[PDB]
């Protein structure tokens, strides 16, 4: 419902909320919208849950085969696999997917795949129903070559605004940092971003 | 035609399977030993022709993250078996949600070899496969499969022409006392020393290829990482 | 035991593959040299002067970065190149990146090995030398009718393969630090001219191609023009 | 790459014999002596185990398998064929009987299915008969305890006490020498152990033989199944009182 | 050299006009025992040779009889079932490339049109009614 | 819906050591009666199956289950049991997941081994409802439920069970427009099976 | 396929005495939301072909991948793949039209309007149109979608018939194209201020101008409008 | 030979004897000569009859308005190959609106011929072909063998007693290449070349066929009285 | 229908109601909604009863085959993947909503699956028509430090609340407790707070009341 990915200076941070609603009722108050595809190169998905889970499983299997047979996949390879899966089933699935990854050569890459199967790189990406309320703010407060803490603060502010102004979005704020050091998981509770 | 297709001879034998077994022997010897929490495989990298690129001449394949395989026999059938094993492991992980155990993959490859030996339109593969891993429920594990569809697990194993000497030395060592070393480097050095005892030729860093299966993952050792054990063995 | 494709001999050999290798032995000389960046050279027998010069190209291009030469039954090599083009196109469609040279070599090896598993087909009667440049650098590979392939610093096959192998070994020993691109082209021309001596009483045409970083932008291009004439003159001088 | 092996590889000889089936029987005969004894409260299946190499772990390979919680099997002949046939029988026991009627198939019907599978290999195209002879031990509510033998020809026969392998004749003679009407499960186990010890050339311990029993009930193993494969320690304890 | 292992081309004629496989199967049956299954409530069959193929054919006959009963709501006549089984056995003697069945069948059946009848059939596919064995 | 075109009523009750299954006899096209001799209770060995709904589907299910029962008896050389037949009916109904038969099948009988009475009901797609008191199907299921919730006592004698089930069936049919035209009651005991016809108004 | 999700905007093109000019903006609208910017909708094929695509952009990427594959295929076993056996605008347009018609006949169309522009090997300017349903036609001036209603009337004021083509210089055509783009930005709610322009000339060749911006706009008079009465 | 029952068997020296028999089937056919210049390409064919009461079999088949061929060997295989070439040319003209190049047709025929020499259950073709064409790169002449080998030459000859025509073409190579302004002169050169292969035979209006293609010249066949002035 | 699942420190508990209805009429008042997929893996289902039962039986048969093939204990993740793939293959036409819970060598697991194949994890889950009351009770009385008895009381409370406050639920409460290292899970109607009162008058007819035409 509120999904984001930003590449600052040393890697990529992907952030999301944790609210899953089956209508006006909250079906899952704390859901993990961040799914691992490989060790690196993994981000969050929006839209229908079943389609996104199936696409994520298929992409994970395909990239496992790619790693076993031809070396190590890049972020663009995962973006292409997602694009093919979304485009060939254009009339069958409604997912919407952002893919974020890290590698030594490029040091952080993001790809956006909306409904219809198109793919765009962009320096930062926002998606979901709540992101509609943060289009201006994210445009007014994004800079290239930021530090990790500044990126965490920017994601926290944007996701807090999205949670506040969207009914179907917002539990806790989950963040994943992918850099050369490794993969780091962060969680921010409502008492933090609401104040 | 009992000697040309996989049909029974009057005495009840399959000659094509035996011929594939003969074809399993270039004459590279390989060894596999399991320790406390790791498994080590070593193979001979014989490249007498200087035109070949040494890094591309290998008989060890990383099937999955935790499983490694060493093949004895011609390399085309080895690559065929490696690709099949990789596909089966990936399919198992996708379908069942957890990593394929080493013995399960060995059983699947044995079933495929049996199917090859059962149909008259498919010849048996002339290779011998050894799968090594650290299974999450069984610890270190070594399983060998042959062109006859047979497969079984080993405390330690050796494949090649003069495998009898290595097997005799290993069984004598086990009668004396797995390996009680908690670090895989010690197990690698022990395997190298045992191979030197059985096949004495003073292996250099370019005459060996080593794969190590630990709990986290399976990997292989480069020539620079290979020459450190023999220096350590010599300095002891 | 030499009548079917997928029958093991009592000693474990496949005689059909060996006969395919014998068929390869009758082919013309084709060589490939890898430099630091790669270079492919082929000899075309001029059976008669009626043939139009520079109209029977034998070196083939896969994608925009793979170059392939073959010795043996030319139609078999063309069929293998078509299959390789299909596989490269499928890989590029599925992953959006040009297929790495080791992956292409593995695909070709799997295809050739599958062509030795049944008696309804026969093994390919060609040996292929193919290479190029990818993100990991410059690669050269040699594939045989049995399906086994290896990477080489220098490779050669055909009637005059032994002299070419000796020259390649001498060049490798004399250049422990590698070769440039133009020097590699000149050496390939010289080796082709020296290996042509297995026929002598037959005119021949030299065809050279290269694919390296710089001077070709990582793509495969045929050596044509003043450079080819300089290479021919250098080969004739030696 | 086409199969083009549609014709059958097993045909009749001028004397009326099927050569491939006879050769499969010959391959079976040069195997390992496996025996089965039916009692009033169970059925015992015993076999000998060989060591391919001293370094090989014998417990990684089991020569007796559980087909259903109440039906088990043993083989004499080619091991990989037995393993593939066990997998096929396990699949058939579910995809043909249990998924329709909600119950595990009776022993006779499962033996019929296995015999049909083995017969399909002697008449279809581009195949060879399985080089194994199977002993099936089972229990069902209406038929009681049953023991069957299935040959490579696909013909199955019910037996009260049978044996196959190299020492099949001597083991059969020993079993038929004294077979009473009051045999118990432990009496059957003792007789099987004695016959296996007589047939074997030595090294008769708990780690060189494999035994399984069908009977009674094991709710402790439910998590009950009537199939119990005895552990090595229990076999050693029983041999200490032999 | 796709597959030259065809076992004497089972479904061909001899130079004298005979079928070798059928005669060999008849020899195999004659070398078997001397002649117990229920096809339905009114028909029984005795088998000779290759009990597995006999069981397969008996299952097929049971399926055919039950199909006839479902279709017509009447018990199948003995002759129809015997003819169907004989045609099934003859089919393998003319096409398919497989070996013929090695089973001889003796059917005893009662219908409402003939009042107790007996038949016999062989691998050649020819069935004959007999007053007594 | 096809289940309310031909009409029908089937009920089943349990007794001390016996069961009872009763059904109506009316068969009509919508509001026009056609036949008054259309029994809806069939027998397979010692089990009884009462089907309500579309008459063609009832006949098709009867023929298919007779086929399956004959093949099962031939293969296993024994009569089917009510629980095994219930599982078979459920599986067969679920086989037509997207093309289900518009039927109201009900299974009753006494197990040969245990001797326990057994009654079960099914929906159109094969969901087993194993109830120890009674099972109801037809176009007047609510009336049968109201009649059977009261008037029913556990472990009733067959003589009293007959009266109870007959009164319930008659009073349920009298308030249903698409059921009637006579009634048939089976009292199933240990290899006894007594069949009776009831007297009722012809609407 | 059945409905476009991310859609492009008008593509305009015209012929001048020595070649063709084709321009298109760089917007990736998502309905009423201008979601994506910097999307190139002019695909150069060879040194003599430009393909302009309007409509669904996922299908645009699909057919540009098809064009890349076609370019790769044309070079196979073709020693003259860059001199005389190279691809031409006519061949590319025929392939695209065949693909579009085949997609239409299967009720699975590519939601695009495509303009193919270039110079033929004999010096003749090629400029043709295709879309879904496989409808094809040619004209001295072409425009897709919204620009078909506003850009065409202006361009036809300069090149009205065939005989006007030899009388039009490249400067006049480029000025007309820029003015048409400014008008489209004035009156189209799905338009963007930035656009790309390609010129194909028989003599000079292919000239590509990216990151162009609409300028010299008029807004001063808006200070004098107040209320609605 | 034990290695001759099928095409999927290699000889111990690495030979395919079925392909060799297919090649020998060509040697038992009539002689056909092909030549070309910068502007035109010409095929000359000598036809045969069963007897005096039968007609002469056609030896030249048109594939497209810019490409044609002449056959030597099994006529039905030539018909199959010509139909395949017509289909390929039509596909190229429809999908891309481009005239198919002669080299592309050569590659297609090479691939199709190869596909019949490697799979069990089939046989190689038994006809040799001389294909002429004109395209954007000029005039082209190609020689096709059933083994899949396709060659490009200024002139060639196939069939029986073809060595005389080939020797004449080799000797006069420097002459017929420059014949561009006169198609009839090139036709005369081809006729004189094929005359060297005649074994006590005379060219008549009944056994001579002449096909020509050129720059401003659709593929045109002359037979019967059309070849009266070329004799 | 109400189904709840609560994960305590070293195991899971699954509880359910026992009422199955068609429309506004109660079909069966003692339906069993706890399904045994594996001796240590149990699932409960809501929605179409036939679809849930068939899917559970098929997945259980496949799980048993897998356990026989691998000579290993079945895992909850395997059943989860099989169920979700099977449900997704039918695009939600198989209307089953499942709560799966089990104990395996990797620990204790609890998941929820929807009819379209989507899955989720949690420490306490509720499904069915009356799932909102059970969810409110769980949110009111859940803590991360739970023992076996506290969990078995929480599940009963949630099921009882869902029974009382939803017209689609009623009758008794079925419980199933899975703990690491032991079987248990044999509750079978722990609570039965819907006992019907005795009827005011007996309605046993005297013999001979019904008229019989023929026998």
Describe the structure.
This is part of a larger assembly, with nine protein chains of nine kinds. Chain D has 242 residues and is an alpha+beta fold. Helices cover 34% and strands 23% of the residues of chain D. Chain D has a single domain, classed as 4-Layer Sandwich (Glutamine Phosphoribosylpyrophosphate, subunit 1, domain 1), CATH 3.60.20.10. Chain D has helices at residues 19-29, 79-101, 107-120, 168-177, 185-199, 232-240, and strands at residues 34-38, 43-48, 64-68, 71-77, 132-140, 144-150, 156-158, 161-164, 209-214, 227-229. In chain D, the strands form two sheets. Chain D has a five-stranded antiparallel β-sheet with strand order 8-1-2-9-10. A five-stranded antiparallel β-sheet of chain D has the order 3-4-5-6-7. In chain D, a hairpin with a 3-residue loop joins β5 and β6. By secondary structure, chain F is of the alpha+beta class. Chain F is built from four helices and twelve strands. In chain F, the strands form three sheets. Chain F has a five-stranded antiparallel β-sheet, with helices on one face. Chain F has a five-stranded antiparallel β-sheet with strand order 5-6-7-8-9, covered by helices on one side. In chain F, β3 (27-29) and β4 (32-35) form a beta hairpin. Chain F is globular, with a radius of gyration of 16 Å. In chain F, 51% of the residues are buried. Helices cover 27% and strands 27% of the residues of chain G. Chain G has helices at residues 57-74, 89-105, 147-155, 170-187, and strands at residues 11-16, 19-25, 42-45, 49-55, 112-119, 125-131, 137-138, 141-143, 194-201, 205-213. In chain G, the strands form two sheets. In chain G, strands 8-1-2-9-10 form a five-stranded antiparallel β-sheet, covered by helices on one side. In chain G, strands 3-4-5-6-7 form a five-stranded antiparallel β-sheet, covered by helices on one side. In chain G, α3 (147-155) packs antiparallel against α4. The longest helix of chain G has 18 residues, at 57-74. Chain G starts with 10 loop residues before the first strand and ends in a 16-residue tail after the last strand. Chain H has helices spanning 17-27, 75-95, 102-115, 163-171, 173-176, 183-195; strands spanning 32-36, 40-46, 60-64, 67-73, 127-135, 138-144, 150-152, 155-158, 208-214, 217-223. In chain H, β9 and β10 (217-223) form a beta hairpin. The radius of gyration of chain H is 18 Å and the shape is globular. The N and C termini of chain H lie far apart (47 Å). The interface between C and H is medium-sized, with 33 and 35 residues.
């Amino acid at each position: 419902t509120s999904i984001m990915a930003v590449t600052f200076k040393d890697g990529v941070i992907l952030g999301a909320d944790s609210r899953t609603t089956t209508g006006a009722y909250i079906a899952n108050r704390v859901t993990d919208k961040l799914t691992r595809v490989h060790d690196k190169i993994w981000c969050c998905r929006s839209g229908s849950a079943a389609d996104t889970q199936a696409i994520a499983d298929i992409v994970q299997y395909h990239l496992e085969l790619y790693t076993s047979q031809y070396g190590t996949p890049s972020t663009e390879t995962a973006a292409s696999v997602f694009k093919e899966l979304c485009y060939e089933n254009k009339d069958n699935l409604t997912a919407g997917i952002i893919v974020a990854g890290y590698d030594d050569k490029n040091k952080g890459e993001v790809y956006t795949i909306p409904l219809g199967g198109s793919v765009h790189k962009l320096p930062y990406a926002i998606a979901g129903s709540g992101s509609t309320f943060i289009y201006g703010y994210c445009d007014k407060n994004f800079r290239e070559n930021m530090s990790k803490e500044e990126t965490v603060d920017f994601i926290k502010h944007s996701l807090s605004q999205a949670i506040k102004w969207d009914g179907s979005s917002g539990g806790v704020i989950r963040m994943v940092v992918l850099t050369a050091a490794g993969v780091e998981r962060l969680i921010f509770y409502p008492d933090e971003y609401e104040q | 035609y009992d000697r040309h297709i996989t049909i029974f001879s009057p005495e009840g034998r399959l000659y094509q399977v035996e011929y594939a077994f003969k074809a399993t022997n270039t004459n590279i010897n390989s060894l596999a030993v399991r320790g406390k929490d790791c498994t080590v495989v070593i193979s001979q990298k014989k490249v007498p022709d200087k035109l070949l690129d040494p890094t591309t001449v290998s008989y060890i394949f990383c099937i999955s993250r935790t499983i490694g395989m060493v093949v004895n026999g011609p390399i085309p059938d080895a690559r065929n078996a490696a690709l099949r094993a990789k596909a089966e492991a990936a399919e198992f992980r996708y379908k069942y949600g957890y990593d394929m155990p080493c013995d399960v993959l060995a059983k699947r490859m044995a079933n495929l070899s049996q199917i090859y030996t059962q149909r008259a339109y498919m010849r048996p593969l002339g290779v011998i496969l050894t799968f090594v891993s650290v299974d999450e429920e069984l610890g270190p594990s070594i399983y060998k499969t042959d062109p006859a569809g047979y497969y079984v697990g080993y405390k330690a194993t050796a494949t090649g022409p003069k495998q009898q000497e290595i097997t005799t030395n290993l069984e004598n060592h086990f009668k004396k006392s797995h390996i009680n070393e908690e670090s895989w480097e010690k197990v690698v050095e022990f395997a190298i020393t045992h191979m030197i005892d059985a096949l004495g030729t003073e292996f250099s860093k370019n005459d060996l290829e080593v794969g190590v299966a630990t709990k986290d993952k399976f990997f292989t050792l480069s020539a620079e990482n290979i020459e450190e054990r023999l220096v350590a063995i010599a300095e002891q | 035991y030499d009548l079917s494709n997928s029958v093991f001999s009592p000693d474990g050999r496949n005689f059909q593959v060996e006969y395919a290798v014998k068929a390869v032995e009758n082919g013309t000389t084709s060589i490939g040299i890898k430099c630091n960046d790669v270079v492919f050279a082929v000899e075309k027998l001029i059976t008669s002067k009626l043939l139009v010069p520079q109209k029977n190209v034998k070196i083939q291009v896969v994608d925009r970065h793979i170059g392939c030469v073959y010795s043996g039954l030319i139609p078999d090599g063309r069929h293998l190149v078509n299959r390789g083009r299909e596989e490269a196109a499928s890989f590029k469609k599925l992953y959006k990146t040009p297929i790495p040279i080791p992956a292409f070599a593995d695909r070709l090896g799997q295809y050739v090995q599958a062509h030795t598993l049944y008696n309804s087909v026969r093994p390919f009667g060609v040996s292929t030398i193919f290479g190029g440049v990818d993100k990991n650098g410059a690669h050269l590979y040699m594939l045989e009718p049995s399906g086994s392939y290896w990477g080489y610093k220098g490779a050669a096959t055909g009637k005059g393969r032994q002299s070419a192998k000796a020259e390649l070994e001498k060049l490798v020993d004399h250049h422990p630090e590698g070769l440039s691109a133009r020097e590699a082209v000149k050496q390939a021309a010289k080796i082709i001219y020296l290996a042509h001596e297995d026929n002598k009483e037959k005119d021949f045409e030299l065809e050279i191609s290269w694919c390296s970083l710089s001077e070709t932008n990582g793509l495969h291009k045929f050596v044509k023009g003043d450079l080819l004439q300089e290479a021919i003159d250098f080969a004739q001088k030696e | 790459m086409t199969d083009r092996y549609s014709f059958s590889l097993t045909t009749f000889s001028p004397s009326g014999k099927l050569g491939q089936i006879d050769y499969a029987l010959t391959a079976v005969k040069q195997g390992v002596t496996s025996l089965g004894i039916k009692a009033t409260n169970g059925v015992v299946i015993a076999t000998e185990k060989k060591s391919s190499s001293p370094l090989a772990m014998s417990e990684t390979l089991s020569k007796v398998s559980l087909l259903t919680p109440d039906i088990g099997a043993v083989y004499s002949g080619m091991g990989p064929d037995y393993r593939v046939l066990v997998d096929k029988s396990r699949k058939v026991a579910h995809t043909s009987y249990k998924r329709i009627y909600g119950e595990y198939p009776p022993t006779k019907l499962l033996v019929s299915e296995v015999a049909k599978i083995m017969q399909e290999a002697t008449q279809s195209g581009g195949v060879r008969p399985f080089g194994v002879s199977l002993l099936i031990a089972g229990h069902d509510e209406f038929n009681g305890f049953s023991l069957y033998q299935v040959d490579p020809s696909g013909s199955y026969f019910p037996w009260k006490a049978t044996a196959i392998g190299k020492g099949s004749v001597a083991a059969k003679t020993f079993l038929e020498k004294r077979w009473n009407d009051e045999l118990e499960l432990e009496d059957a186990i003792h007789i099987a152990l004695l016959t296996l010890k007589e047939s074997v050339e030595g090294e008769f311990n708990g780690d060189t033989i494999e035994l399984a029993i069908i009977g009674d009930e094991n709710p402790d193993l439910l998590g009950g199944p009537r199939f119990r494969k005895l552990t090595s320690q229990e076999i050693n304890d029983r041999l200490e009182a032999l | 050299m796709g597959s030259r292992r065809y076992d004497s081309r089972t479904t061909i004629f001899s130079p004298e006009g005979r079928l070798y496989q059928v005669e060999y199967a008849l020899e195999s049956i004659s070398h078997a025992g001397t002649a117990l299954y229920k096809l339905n409530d009114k028909i029984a069959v005795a088998v000779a040779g290759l009990t597995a193929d006999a069981e397969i054919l008996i299952n097929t006959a049971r399926i055919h009889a039950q199909n006839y009963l479902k279709t017509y709501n009447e018990d199948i006549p003995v002759e129809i079932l015997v003819r169907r089984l004989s045609d099934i056995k003859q089919g393998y003697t003319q096409h398919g490339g497989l070996r013929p069945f090695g089973v001889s069948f003796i059917y005893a059946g009662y219908d409402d049109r003939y009042g107790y009848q007996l038949y016999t059939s062989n691998p050649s596919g020819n069935y004959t009614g007999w007053k007594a064995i | 819906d096809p289940s309310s075109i031909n009409g029908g009523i089937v009920v089943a009750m349990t007794g001390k050591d016996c069961v009872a299954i009763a059904c109506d006899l009316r068969l009509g096209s919508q509001s026009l009666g056609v036949s008054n001799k259309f029994e809806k209770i069939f027998h397979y060995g010692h089990v009884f199956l009462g089907i309500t709904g579309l008459a063609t589907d009832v006949t098709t299910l009867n023929e298919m289950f007779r086929y399956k029962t004959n093949l099962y008896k031939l293969k296993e050389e024994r009569a089917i049991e009510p629980e095994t037949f219930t599982q078979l009916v459920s599986s067969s109904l679920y086989e037509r997941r997207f093309g289900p038969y518009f039927v109201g099948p009900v299974v009753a009988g006494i197990n040969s081994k245990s001797g326990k009475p057994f009654i079960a009901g099914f929906d159109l797609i094969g969901c087993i409802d194993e109830a120890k008191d009674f099972i109801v199907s037809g176009t007047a299921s609510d009336q049968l439920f109201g009649m059977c919730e009261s008037l029913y006592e556990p472990n009733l004698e067959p003589e009293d069970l007959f009266e109870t089930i007959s009164q319930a069936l008659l009073n349920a049919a009298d308030r249903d427009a698409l059921s009637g035209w006579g009634a048939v009651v089976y009292i199933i005991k240990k290899d006894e099976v007594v069949k009776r016809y009831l007297k009722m108004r012809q609407d | 396929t059945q409905q476009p999700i991310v859609t492009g905007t008008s593509v305009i093109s015209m012929k001048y005495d020595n070649g063709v000019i084709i321009a298109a903006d760089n917007l990736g609208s998502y309905g009423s939301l201008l979601r994506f910017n910097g999307v190139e909708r002019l695909i150069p094929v060879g040194d003599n072909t430009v393909v302009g695509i309007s409509g669904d952009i996922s299908d645009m990427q699909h057919i540009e991948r098809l064009l890349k594959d076609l370019v790769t295929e044309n070079a196979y076993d073709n020693p003259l793949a860059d001199a005389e056996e190279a691809l031409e605008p006519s061949y590319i347009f025929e392939y695209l039209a065949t693909v579009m018609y085949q997609r239409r006949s299967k009720m699975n169309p590519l939601w695009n309007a495509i303009i193919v522009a270039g110079v033929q090997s004999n010096g003749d300017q090629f400029l043709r149109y295709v879309n879904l349903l496989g409808v094809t036609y040619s004209s001295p001036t072409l425009a897709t979608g919204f620009g078909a209603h506003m850009a065409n009337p202006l361009l036809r004021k300069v090149v009205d018939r065939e005989s006007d083509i030899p009388k039009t210089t490249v400067q006049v055509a480029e000025e007309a194209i820029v003015n048409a783009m400014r008008v489209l930005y004035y009156r189209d709610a799905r338009s963007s201020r930035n656009f790309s322009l390609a010129i194909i000339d028989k003599n000079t060749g292919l000239t590509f101008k990216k990151n162009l911006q609409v300028e010299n706009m008029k807004w001063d008079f808006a200070k004098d409008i107040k209320g609605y009465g | 030979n034990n290695y001759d029952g099928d095409t999927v068997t290699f000889s111990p020296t690495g030979r395919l004897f079925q392909v060799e028999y297919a090649l020998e089937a060509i040697k038992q056919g009539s002689v056909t000569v092909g030549l070309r210049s910068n502007t035109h390409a010409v095929l000359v064919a000598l036809k045969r009859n069963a007897d005096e009461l039968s007609s002469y079999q056609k030896k030249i088949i048109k594939c497209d308005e810019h490409m044609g061929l002449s056959l030597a060997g099994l006529a039905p295989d030539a018909r199959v190959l010509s139909n395949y070439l017509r289909q390929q040319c039509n596909y190229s003209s429809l999908v891309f609106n481009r005239k198919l190049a002669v080299e592309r047709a050569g590659h297609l025929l090479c691939d199709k011929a190869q596909k019949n020499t490697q799979s069990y259950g089939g046989r190689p073709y038994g006809v040799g072909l001389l294909i002429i064409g004109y395209d954007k790169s000029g005039a082209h002449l190609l020689e096709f063998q059933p083994s899949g080998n396709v060659t490009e030459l200024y002139g060639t000859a196939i069939g029986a007693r073809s060595q005389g025509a080939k020797t004449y073409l080799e000797r006069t190579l420097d002459t017929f290449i420059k014949i561009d302004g006169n198609p009839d002169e090139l036709i005369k050169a081809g006729v004189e070349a094929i005359s060297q292969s005649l074994r006590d035979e005379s060219l008549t209006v009944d056994n001579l066929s002449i096909a020509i293609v050129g720059k401003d010249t659709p593929f045109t066949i002359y037979d019967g009285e059309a070849v009266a002035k070329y004799i | 229908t109400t189904i709840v699942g609560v994960k305590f420190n070293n195991g899971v508990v699954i509880a359910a109601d026992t009422r199955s209805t068609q429309g506004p009429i109660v079909a069966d008042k003692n339906c069993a909604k706890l399904h045994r997929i594996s001796p240590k893996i149990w699932c409960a289902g809501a929605g179409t009863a036939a679809d849930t039962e068939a899917v559970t039986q098929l997945i259980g048969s496949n799980i048993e085959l897998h356990s026989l093939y691998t000579s290993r204990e079945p895992r909850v993740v395997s059943a989860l993947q099989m169920l979700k793939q099977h449900l997704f293959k039918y695009q939600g036409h198989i209307g089953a909503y499942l709560i799966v819970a089990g104990v395996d060598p990797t620990g204790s697991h609890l998941f929820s699956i929807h009819a379209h194949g989507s899955t989720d994890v949690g420490y306490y889950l509720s499904l069915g028509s009356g799932s909102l009351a059970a969810m409110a009770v769980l949110e009111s009385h859940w803590k991360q430090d739970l023992t076996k008895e506290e969990a078995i009381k929480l599940a009963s409370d949630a099921i009882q609340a869902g029974i009382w406050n939803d017209l689609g639920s009623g009758s008794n409460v079925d419980v199933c407790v899975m703990e690491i290292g032991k079987d248990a899970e044999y509750l079978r109607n722990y609570l039965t707070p819907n006992v019907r009162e005795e009827k005011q008058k007996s309605y046993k007819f005297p013999r001979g009341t019904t008229a019989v035409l023929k026998e």
